Amino acid sequence: MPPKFDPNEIKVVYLRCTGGEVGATSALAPKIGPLGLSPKKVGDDIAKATGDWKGLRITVKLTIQNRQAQIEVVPSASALIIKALKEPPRDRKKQKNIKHSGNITFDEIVNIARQMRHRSLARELSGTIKEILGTAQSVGCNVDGRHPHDIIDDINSGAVECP
Amino acid sequence: MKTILSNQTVDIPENVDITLKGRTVIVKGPRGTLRRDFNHINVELSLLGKKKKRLRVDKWWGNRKELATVRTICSHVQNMIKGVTLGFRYKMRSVYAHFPINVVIQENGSLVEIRNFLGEKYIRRVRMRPGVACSVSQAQKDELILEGNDIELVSNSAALIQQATTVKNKDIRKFLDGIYVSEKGTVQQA
Amino acid sequence: DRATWKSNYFLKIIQLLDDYPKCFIVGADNVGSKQMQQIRMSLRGKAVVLMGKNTMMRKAIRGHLENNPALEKLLPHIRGNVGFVFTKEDLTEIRDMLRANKVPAAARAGAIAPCEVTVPAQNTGLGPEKTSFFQALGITTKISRGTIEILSDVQLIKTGDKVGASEATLLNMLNISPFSFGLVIQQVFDNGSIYNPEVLDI
Amino acid sequence: IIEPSLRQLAQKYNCDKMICRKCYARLHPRAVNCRKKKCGHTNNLRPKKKVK
RNA sequence: GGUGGCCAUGGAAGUCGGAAUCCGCUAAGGAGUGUGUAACAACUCACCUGCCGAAUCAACUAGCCCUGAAAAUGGAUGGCG
Ligand SMILES: [Mg+2]
Ligand SMILES: [Zn+2]
């Protein structure tokens, strides 16, 4: 990419959000996608197969360019997994009682959530992120018969196993 | 409430020699000599510093609104000192969409001659005050330089041409043309 | 906020002045909030960066403890943005050297510092003619095919002399990035000692 | 057409103004009070409208 | 920053609107005062720093004057003042 219009591989990053099935309403990326040798349709519908077999409730979506190859990975977002940690999937055409539904445990699955929080956090080790991603709630409301409310004060686990 | 005392010392540099005739301050440095009368304001101007180091303005049986003025005299004196040491320079950059404002100084300073502001046939003329040497700049395109010793005189004169150049019956949000002040500074900086 | 929360900070500074005898005085003049987040995690094995305000002139009140003395030599340096970085494992320079990351660089008109600045007679690579920042001063240049060269060399500005605005802007156009030393290190304290970054100190 | 720094000079002098809601008198950006005796020195100020 | 947070998608990733709604880095930064932006950004403001040196600020309430306050043969604190 540099004095004159060069490249030298294609290993260039682009990130997208949102996802029903895929797209397709005379639309996908454009702007970044078209000049880049990608398309709007084949590299759209191959974004189905990988962002599929269950994602249908908004996604984050890194697409890596290689010549004209668009790699369709679903990189997990902290609230997206906590929406998919739900008593899950009702999907579309009802839904209707809406997405403020809100009752889901994640007792050690938030441990597995704060585990898969890959790098991002620049972390004090669990016992603080456990509280960061525990505190970001609105749907669920903490562990079987509790509220996030009173986990924040304490967490008698994780701490010295994650370092 | 009357305040028994308020005062302020101006620190006078080694270059300059102020000498106050009662209340009337005269200032001579390198550049020239200035004068001004504080035959209104009513204060006590002492020159206490020997060799010659301090102007001190008193104020004395003064209520709030005259206590103000202690500091204002104190200012027009610094403002003189800066004028007679350094000297001031207001720059003013002409501005437009379209018709080139076409300036031409015409005795020495004095006549600042302006064709074509906004296609207008009437050639605006503007006098400077005495001691104000206008001049068209270089090292920049549409830009005047008003040099003088006296702030008072140099900035009416900016404002005279800044105000002579005003649009009428328009959006002056849109019609942003005319000549206006970009930079108040000095001739010599030190 | 702030008769209790104040009196709280006081107990955490007085702690690290006792427990932590190695003190690194750091200048963070240019900094980002995402920058420090990363510097604390890049040095998590080692150091403890401590950021306060004016109150840092409360070394007096730990020195008041009918106790410590040489904390008088810490007095002249609590001024003009400063924080300290308390560390157990120090061990001299060798962790101090690996801290120095990318940065100024910078270079501004009105500055003074480090050593004699040179621009090795190398071919620049800027757009053609672009000789006006050389022609303004005086260096022998030539268009060999397209791009520009200096076909000679010398020191542009020497130690103690001021750098002009045109000679500053030409140096940061060339990519030559000297005159700087902010967010890095100002003055170390280790056991009543007075180090000085002019150079033994490391 | 009219260079940005040049423009935002003139803007400084004709556009960023407060204005009295009583007397329509035009005031500097900082004004919390009018100048005019006529309105009764109001405080009812608003910013001058930025041209779209 | 965790962070296209949630609702809303028409865009609202801090921001036409609302439930809300809390941690990290902490220093300190509101899941945001605004500009504005389709949305951002970019900017700004809370918060917090750098530099300076001692008084500073806000809401009320009153005293005095200023405004509200506009009439017809010329013009009346009695006049002069
Ligand atoms: Mg009209
Ligand atoms: Zn008014």
XYZ file of C-alpha atoms in Angstrom, chain A:
163
model
C 0.000 0.000 0.000
C 2.589 2.594 -0.106
C 4.304 5.151 -2.634
C 2.677 4.160 -5.821
C -0.164 1.626 -5.181
C 1.481 -1.568 -3.967
C 0.280 -4.285 -1.590
C 2.384 -7.461 -0.921
C 0.223 -10.444 0.279
C -3.128 -9.197 1.487
C -3.229 -9.644 5.296
C -5.452 -6.629 6.083
C -8.135 -6.444 8.832
C -11.759 -5.191 8.706
C -14.346 -5.512 11.546
C -18.190 -5.525 11.286
C -21.153 -5.928 13.685
C -24.797 -7.139 13.397
C -26.222 -10.364 11.964
C -29.598 -11.869 11.214
C -28.886 -14.475 8.569
C -26.236 -12.403 6.640
C -27.262 -9.270 4.695
C -28.142 -9.188 0.951
C -30.552 -6.159 0.638
C -28.324 -4.591 -2.088
C -25.861 -4.457 0.822
C -22.994 -5.904 2.870
C -19.774 -3.893 3.498
C -19.277 -1.896 0.320
C -16.932 1.178 0.763
C -14.136 -1.027 2.301
C -15.243 -4.277 0.536
C -15.495 -3.300 -3.177
C -12.075 -1.669 -3.797
C -10.206 -4.561 -2.238
C -11.192 -7.225 -4.832
C -13.737 -8.896 -2.549
C -17.358 -8.820 -3.737
C -20.815 -8.141 -2.293
C -22.454 -11.648 -2.627
C -20.175 -14.800 -2.526
C -17.977 -13.424 0.323
C -21.303 -12.286 1.808
C -22.993 -15.822 1.723
C -19.786 -17.663 2.862
C -20.054 -15.259 5.906
C -23.266 -17.225 6.590
C -21.641 -20.729 6.966
C -19.071 -19.622 9.633
C -21.272 -17.004 11.399
C -23.997 -19.671 11.658
C -25.154 -22.991 13.213
C -26.123 -20.420 15.968
C -25.413 -16.831 15.814
C -28.755 -15.036 15.143
C -28.842 -12.254 17.819
C -26.320 -9.639 16.542
C -22.589 -10.457 16.241
C -19.161 -8.819 16.034
C -17.348 -10.066 12.888
C -13.647 -9.777 11.872
C -13.137 -10.501 8.155
C -9.456 -11.063 7.201
C -8.576 -10.258 3.565
C -6.202 -12.613 1.575
C -6.033 -11.691 -2.183
C -9.871 -11.981 -2.550
C -10.515 -14.332 0.431
C -12.622 -12.949 3.277
C -12.196 -15.033 6.482
C -15.438 -14.890 8.457
C -14.569 -15.393 12.166
C -17.056 -14.543 15.003
C -14.854 -12.811 17.664
C -16.751 -12.969 20.937
C -18.003 -9.696 22.524
C -18.521 -9.528 26.331
C -22.217 -8.643 26.235
C -22.922 -10.896 23.137
C -21.771 -14.044 24.970
C -23.752 -12.866 28.118
C -26.830 -12.595 25.778
C -25.931 -16.124 24.475
C -25.321 -17.364 28.079
C -29.175 -16.879 28.320
C -31.943 -19.497 28.659
C -31.388 -19.227 24.978
C -32.495 -19.209 21.592
C -35.897 -17.912 20.669
C -34.852 -16.027 17.525
C -37.057 -13.906 15.161
C -40.784 -13.602 14.429
C -41.325 -13.635 18.201
C -38.837 -12.641 20.428
C -41.700 -9.930 20.746
C -41.572 -10.247 24.593
C -38.666 -8.582 23.911
C -34.889 -8.778 24.729
C -35.121 -7.394 28.286
C -36.098 -10.998 29.277
C -33.521 -11.576 31.983
C -32.912 -14.669 34.217
C -29.679 -16.779 33.700
C -27.240 -18.189 36.301
C -23.786 -18.154 34.426
C -22.267 -19.133 37.838
C -18.998 -20.441 36.454
C -19.961 -19.736 32.786
C -19.139 -16.076 33.560
C -15.708 -17.624 34.678
C -15.621 -19.190 31.208
C -16.752 -15.751 29.835
C -13.976 -13.874 31.771
C -11.604 -16.679 30.544
C -12.501 -16.207 26.862
C -12.127 -12.389 27.380
C -8.993 -12.854 25.345
C -6.348 -10.121 26.149
C -8.798 -7.082 25.850
C -9.131 -6.219 29.571
C -5.435 -5.596 30.629
C -6.366 -7.560 33.672
C -6.220 -7.771 37.426
C -6.665 -11.490 37.518
C -10.336 -12.591 37.516
C -11.500 -11.222 40.953
C -11.847 -7.738 39.411
C -13.016 -8.663 35.838
C -15.407 -11.171 37.433
C -16.883 -7.982 38.819
C -16.387 -5.877 35.560
C -18.310 -8.372 33.356
C -20.580 -9.289 36.278
C -21.427 -5.551 36.642
C -22.355 -5.140 32.896
C -25.749 -6.875 33.288
C -29.363 -5.970 32.446
C -30.809 -9.264 31.149
C -29.770 -12.163 33.472
C -29.125 -10.977 37.054
C -26.376 -13.215 38.513
C -26.343 -16.872 39.890
C -29.479 -19.162 40.226
C -31.073 -17.366 43.243
C -29.138 -14.077 43.578
C -28.675 -10.572 41.983
C -25.340 -9.028 40.577
C -25.922 -6.377 43.220
C -24.227 -8.512 45.991
C -21.469 -10.466 44.066
C -19.819 -7.030 43.475
C -19.182 -6.601 47.258
C -17.319 -9.925 47.618
C -16.062 -13.883 44.919
C -14.499 -16.723 46.949
C -13.107 -18.504 43.866
C -10.997 -18.107 40.728
C -8.480 -15.509 42.056
C -5.317 -17.689 42.577
C -6.178 -20.318 39.836
C -6.153 -17.765 36.935
C -2.634 -16.190 37.591
